Amino acid sequence: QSETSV
Amino acid sequence: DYLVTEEEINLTRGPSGLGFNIVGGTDQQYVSNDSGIYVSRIKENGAAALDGRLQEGDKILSVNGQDLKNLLHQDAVDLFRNAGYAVSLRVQHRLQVQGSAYGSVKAYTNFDAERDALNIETAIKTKGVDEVTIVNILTNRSNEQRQDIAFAYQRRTKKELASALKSALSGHLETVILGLLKTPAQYDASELKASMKGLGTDEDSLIEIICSRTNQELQEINRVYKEMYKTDLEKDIISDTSGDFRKLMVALAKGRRAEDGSVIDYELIDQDARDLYDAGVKRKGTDVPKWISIMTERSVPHLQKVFDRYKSYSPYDMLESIRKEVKGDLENAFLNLVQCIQNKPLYFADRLYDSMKGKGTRDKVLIRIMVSRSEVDMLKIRSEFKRKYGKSLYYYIQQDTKGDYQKALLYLCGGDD
Ligand SMILES: [Ca+2]
Ligand SMILES: [Ca+2]
Ligand SMILES: [Ca+2]
Ligand SMILES: [Ca+2]
Ligand SMILES: [Ca+2]
């Protein structure tokens, strides 16, 4: 999980 | 498991960022094994979408020459946060094709064999049994993964998972789940044993399995059958069958059919079409051994063309010719074998329909097909079924079965059409 936006 | 090609992608950071979300890391592994970094979403109109080279599901190998191997999730994110406006990626494109692409049941991605064995314990140990949870797991998991779950459940509980479910389940639902737990060869072997067990053979099931299985599958069935029942499958067939029906079943169960060569033998295609006609419709009686040798030895693509070339000589096609030449078990076996050669998905579609069309349900046929074809050609079966019968296979299962038994079959079906 923890989609992180870059 | 995966097909892999690697690509270098250079992106210019837009004000919104590079325009995609990453997942993974050693502390947040996307699957049970890989600690890698994966693109979980590509923002629309982002710098990566406009560039078009990045794909959702790709693995980020390196960012500006810095490898993303064995990094914490924060360590991977921090590499993007400090990367500047000209970012150079090296990604790995992944295609998940494995097993068959025509199967309803695929391997579960976030697979953890220990948690599933754990959660099936919970269900068996809940009062009244959570069958829904047992069904939701085991029908959503490949047959190989079900083997892992059976291994974990034994180590945790000192009991075989199948023996536990054999007590925690009953009726038609028990038959399905127990079938799903066996390997393809074990299930076919036991189904074959059950059709011959007892003076009086279930030739219907015996024909269906022996006629529809490939060389590879029959070779494995022959090995596992002897391990399970301490006798050869060929010997049990000889004992439960007789006549030319015995010859046909013995030749088919050997699984020594010619493999599909690269070169189409048009000359042999025509000779075999002439032979089949000479042996049957053209003469009085039938040279049945000639029919047996051609239809058991030649490859499936070859015989498909033989049956069409046969229509140039004979006023009836192969199926009509069989109905006019032989009767009894022998006729039943030839008719099934030709259907498997011509269109095996349609053959299973027809047997599914026949198992449900009238009073009640031939559950033994319906269950065996949904189990043994869910990972082979179930999507082709559903396509042929929908095309011919108008309603979906989903719909007919829904009308003929009920309860958690229906739910399991609907999952093995894979969806509506
Ligand atoms: Ca219950
Ligand atoms: Ca029981
Ligand atoms: Ca004849
Ligand atoms: Ca007949
Ligand atoms: Ca019915």
Side-chain angles (χ1 to χ4, degrees), chain A residues 2-6, chain B residues 1-95 99-417:
Chain A
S2 201
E3 300 195 61
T4 300
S5 306
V6 299
Chain B
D1 219 310
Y2 290 104
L3 237 36
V4 157
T5 48
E6 300 188 355
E7 185 177 15
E8 162 163 323
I9 297 173
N10 309 279
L11 290 182
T12 311
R13 202 231 299 116
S16 15
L18 297 163
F20 62 97
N21 303 343
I22 61 175
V23 296
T26 62
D27 59 319
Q28 315 184 25
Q29 287 181 318
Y30 201 38
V31 293
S32 182
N33 173 81
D34 204 332
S35 302
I37 315 300
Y38 292 104
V39 180
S40 58
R41 180 202 165 199
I42 297 181
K43 301 198 200 72
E44 333 83 42
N45 295 324
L50 303 183
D51 182 281
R53 288 180 287 178
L54 192 74
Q55 306 298 319
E56 306 201 335
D58 293 352
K59 179 195 297 186
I60 312 295
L61 307 177
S62 61
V63 173
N64 296 328
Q66 306 164 299
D67 293 357
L68 281 72
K69 189 175 184 284
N70 304 128
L71 295 183
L72 297 162
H73 179 80
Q74 197 60 46
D75 299 353
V77 172
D78 290 9
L79 284 181
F80 283 105
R81 292 285 184 258
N82 296 269
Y85 61 89
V87 180
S88 188
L89 306 175
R90 173 152 200 85
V91 307
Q92 169 179 115
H93 296 261
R94 271 144 70 92
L95 184 57
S100 173
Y102 302 105
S104 58
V105 176
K106 314 280 214 206
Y108 189 64
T109 54
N110 302 326
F111 179 47
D112 178 12
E114 293 289 341
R115 184 129 87 97
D116 286 334
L118 169 75
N119 294 331
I120 290 161
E121 214 204 359
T122 312
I124 290 166
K125 289 226 255 260
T126 54
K127 232 211 331 149
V129 175
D130 201 4
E131 306 186 2
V132 195
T133 271
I134 302 176
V135 172
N136 286 334
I137 304 175
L138 293 184
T139 61
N140 207 20
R141 302 273 188 298
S142 64
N143 192 280
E144 289 188 357
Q145 290 164 327
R146 301 192 200 109
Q147 301 302 315
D148 290 11
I149 301 168
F151 178 82
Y153 192 95
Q154 205 290 327
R155 197 205 321 102
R156 163 185 282 274
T157 69
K158 288 187 179 182
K159 269 200 301 176
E160 310 292 344
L161 172 63
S163 285
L165 292 172
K166 196 153 168 55
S167 291
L169 299 174
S170 53
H172 288 318
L173 176 61
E174 170 185 352
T175 297
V176 170
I177 299 297
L178 257 47
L180 296 172
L181 293 178
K182 290 189 181 66
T183 70
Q186 290 166 350
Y187 183 62
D188 277 2
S190 48
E191 290 288 320
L192 281 178
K193 184 63 172 183
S195 73
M196 289 184 279
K197 254 194 262 250
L199 233 64
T201 321
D202 182 8
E203 299 90 355
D204 189 62
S205 294
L206 183 74
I207 289 180
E208 169 198 322
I209 304 176
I210 296 296
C211 286
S212 65
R213 266 50 170 173
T214 67
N215 279 7
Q216 178 192 232
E217 299 163 332
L218 287 170
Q219 189 163 331
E220 192 59 40
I221 290 161
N222 278 320
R223 181 187 75 86
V224 165
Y225 193 102
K226 195 182 190 177
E227 302 192 273
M228 289 173 60
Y229 305 118
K230 307 309 171 186
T231 184
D232 279 321
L233 165 68
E234 172 175 298
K235 302 182 180 304
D236 279 1
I237 291 170
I238 287 163
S239 93
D240 266 273
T241 65
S242 66
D244 297 325
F245 178 64
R246 170 197 288 182
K247 293 176 179 175
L248 188 48
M249 293 297 100
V250 166
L252 279 167
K254 283 184 179 305
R256 298 209 289 252
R257 166 184 312 271
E259 286 181 354
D260 351 25
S262 35
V263 188
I264 294 158
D265 195 352
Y266 292 105
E267 168 160 45
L268 185 56
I269 284 167
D270 177 74
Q271 196 167 287
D272 290 331
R274 288 179 63 92
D275 283 0
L276 290 180
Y277 184 55
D278 214 310
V281 177
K282 203 183 180 184
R283 76 164 61 182
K284 182 204 171 185
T286 305
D287 188 359
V288 175
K290 174 60 67 166
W291 274 15
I292 297 181
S293 53
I294 295 197
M295 300 195 202
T296 59
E297 280 150 36
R298 308 290 189 269
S299 75
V300 173
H302 176 99
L303 282 172
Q304 289 172 337
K305 306 181 186 62
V306 168
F307 296 158
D308 185 63
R309 181 59 184 164
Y310 175 85
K311 292 201 260 186
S312 138
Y313 293 110
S314 171
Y316 320 101
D317 64 4
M318 200 65 247
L319 288 183
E320 289 147 19
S321 295
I322 293 166
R323 301 185 188 100
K324 293 185 170 302
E325 287 300 302
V326 293
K327 45 186 174 67
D329 288 325
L330 188 62
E331 167 185 21
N332 197 23
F334 274 129
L335 289 179
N336 283 248
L337 179 50
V338 171
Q339 293 174 57
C340 293
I341 296 170
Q342 293 179 350
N343 190 330
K344 199 181 293 174
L346 177 62
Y347 164 78
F348 284 121
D350 286 339
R351 284 196 62 102
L352 283 166
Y353 180 72
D354 288 351
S355 81
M356 291 183 277
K357 54 174 193 197
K359 197 193 171 45
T361 316
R362 252 186 289 276
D363 294 283
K364 192 157 81 68
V365 177
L366 168 60
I367 288 167
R368 173 172 61 246
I369 292 180
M370 299 307 303
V371 168
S372 65
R373 307 308 286 189
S374 49
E375 271 170 280
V376 177
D377 52 2
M378 182 59 62
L379 302 177
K380 287 188 183 185
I381 293 170
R382 288 165 43 182
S383 174
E384 297 281 2
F385 191 107
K386 172 64 180 293
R387 184 184 306 115
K388 176 170 177 177
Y389 298 111
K391 288 284 201 304
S392 68
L393 167 63
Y394 181 102
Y395 168 87
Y396 274 87
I397 289 174
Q398 180 186 75
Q399 304 307 314
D400 251 62
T401 61
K402 295 294 173 295
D404 298 325
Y405 169 49
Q406 173 200 99
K407 303 175 189 170
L409 292 184
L410 291 180
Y411 274 122
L412 294 183
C413 183
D416 207 353
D417 293 300

